[PDB]
């Protein structure tokens, strides 16, 4: 059972003629391995790839080690560098043991930022801006869970690689329901943040929050009150460099102690559609929420892990504006939303539409409010969101979403999709993605708003098709087009003849594979490869490009 696989070949524009020579190895029922010499001609060497998949008591895992001893292209583009070797180490492992012990490992290390662009995309992607390295060991039971975790990142951005790592992190939760009328919950955290730089702030943070909530529900109404008490202690060190450059001074000790009051309410009105359709039921659900959080000055704390969150219709009712626990903005706001649902004769929901908004009474301040909003509106109806989903038939359906901001004075983000799918082998889909340049300027870093590859925003139209022929072939295609640039972003074609003993596949893809900093245009990469193996493989081919297909129904 251990032997050579059938060889594979490709012709690219970055490694030119390529050749795989896989060798399988059944080591045990629970362990298998594969050694793949990958000859690359432009780089003039062999990348030795090694995969090792294992199933154990702890869980299931895959390890990959790719090693190219020397590279000619990298040597040419880095003449003064010490060495030209390339390597990648990947390690994924997920598993739960005895229903209590949860083990998660997701490690990816590369030798240089340019690895993903220059080589295959099995576990990486040229689109990735960074690689992640996470370890997690946890213990979870019905009313308790704890987790010790390590987070590290390898950013591929040359402009600023500097990233913060939460090397130790502890997440303790406890739930005590049915404490009289109320239900109680407690969350605890201890984290140590270190930077790769030797002159960036370093901090240890201890966080504790109790939570008590009263739920009251009827057949039509649901009212829930909630009170939280956030308490955070920061011990920050190595802060001389920051204070030598910025007028705001970081403190060595910070205590932040704030309450949160939240009230949620929702109703369910119902009616029977008669003229429009027989035996169809429409449901109108109003939902309201009031949130109050007092303001504290967070200027003494560096923003380690707080980022602005997107506000979809579901995100309108989220109490947090930033992530993490560094920037907790004040809140005096009421959010209103309405959802309409259509139910057919079989009580299957065929349509739903949502629309909501957020109305502020006071400005959401955090002490370090440096977001570049396009206007100076601080209170009032500021955020709007809306979603829709329609299942027209068994084989036909569409989706849509939109978010509008008055502070940006524009539609921040939008999406739309419409799909025809008879089965895994036969389907058609059309999708659209939008993101205004104002949103890019407001949320993304400063250099995004000035760089040509980022400042324009997103306006992307995609089409995906899969059509079988004679129940043996499967023609698969996808095309993605940027309408601001009027340029292709990604395109792929594929043909697979699947017989009973073999399935030959030929594929082609042209993708955006980087920017050229001199001529100010994008670099496209082309790849044409054939794959023999000893279903029609439609879904596998649909997932092979940098913008993989996803089922929308």
């Amino acid at each position: 059972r251990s032997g050579f696989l059938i060889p594979n070949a490709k012709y690219t524009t970055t490694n030119y003629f390529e050749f795989y020579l896989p060798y399988y190895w059944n080591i045990a029922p629970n362990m298998d391995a594969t050694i793949t010499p990958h000859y690359m001609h432009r780089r003039g060497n062999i990348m030795w790839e090694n995969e090792f998949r294992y199933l154990s008591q702890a869980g299931a895992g895959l390890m990959e080690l790719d090693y190219l001893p020397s590279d000619k292209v990298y040597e040419d583009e880095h003449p003064n560098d010490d060495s030209s070797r390339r390597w990648l180490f990947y390690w994924n492992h997920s598993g739960v043991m005895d229903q209590v012990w949860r083990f998660n490992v997701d490690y990816t290390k590369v030798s240089d930022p340019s690895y993903f662009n220059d080589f295959d995309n099995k576990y990486g992607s040229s689109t990735d801006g960074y690689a992640t390295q996470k370890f997690s060991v946890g213990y979870a039971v019905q009313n308790f869970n704890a987790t010790v975790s390590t987070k590290q990142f390898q950013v591929f951005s040359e402009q600023n690689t500097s990233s913060y790592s939460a090397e130790p992190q502890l997440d303790v939760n406890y739930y005590q329901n049915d404490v009289g009328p109320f239900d109680t919950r407690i969350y605890g955290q201890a984290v140590h943040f270190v930077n790769t730089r030797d002159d960036m702030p370093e901090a240890t943070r201890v966080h504790l929050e109790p939570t008590i909530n009263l739920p009251l529900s009827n057949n039509w109404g649901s009212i829930n009150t909630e009170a939280k008490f956030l308490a955070t202690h920061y011990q920050q060190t190595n802060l001389d460099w920051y204070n030598s450059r910025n007028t705001t001074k970081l403190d060595e000790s910070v205590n932040r102690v704030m309450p949160q009051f939240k009230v949620d309410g929702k109703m369910v009105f119902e009616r029977d559609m008669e003229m429009l359709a027989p035996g169809y039921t429409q449901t109108l659900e109003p939902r309201a929420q009031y949130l109050y959080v007092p303001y504290r000055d967070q200027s003494d704390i560096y923003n380690y892990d707080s980022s602005l969150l997107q506000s979809d219709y579901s995100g309108l009712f989220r109490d947090r504006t930033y992530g993490g626990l560094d920037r907790i903005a004040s809140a005096n706001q009421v959010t209103t939303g309405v959802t309409s649902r259509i139910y057919d004769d079989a009580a299957v929901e065929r349509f739903n539409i949502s629309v909501g908004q957020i109305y502020y009474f006071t400005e959401s301040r955090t002490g370090d409010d440096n977001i570049t909003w396009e206007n100076d509106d601080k209170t009032g109806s500021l955020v709007w969101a809306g979603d829709t989903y329609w299942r027209i038939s068994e084989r036909w359906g569409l989706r849509g979403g939109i978010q509008y901001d008055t502070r940006l004075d524009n539609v921040a983000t939008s999406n739309s999709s419409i799909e025809y799918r008879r089965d895994e082998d036969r389907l058609v889909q059309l999708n659209y993605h939008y993101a205004s340049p104002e949103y890019i300027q407001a949320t993304l870093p400063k250099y995004y708003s000035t760089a040509e590859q980022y400042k324009n925003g997103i306006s992307q139209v995609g089409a995906v098709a899969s059509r079988p022929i004679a129940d043996r072939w499967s023609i698969v295609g996808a095309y993605y087009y940027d309408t601001n640039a009027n340029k292709q972003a990604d395109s792929m074609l594929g043909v697979q003849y699947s017989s009973c003993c073999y399935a030959i596949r030929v594929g082609y893809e042209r993708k955006l594979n980087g920017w050229d900093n001199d001529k100010q245009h994008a670099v496209y990469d082309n790849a044409i490869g054939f794959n023999i193996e000893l279903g029609l493989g439609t879904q596998e081919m649909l997932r092979s490009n940098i913008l993989p297909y996803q089922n929308t129904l």
Binding site: V148, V191, H192, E202
Partner: peptide, 14 residues
Amino acid sequence: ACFWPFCNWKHGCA
């Protein structure tokens, strides 16, 4: 006393 994991061990002894 020592919180070795959850403390400032990169630059703390400076």
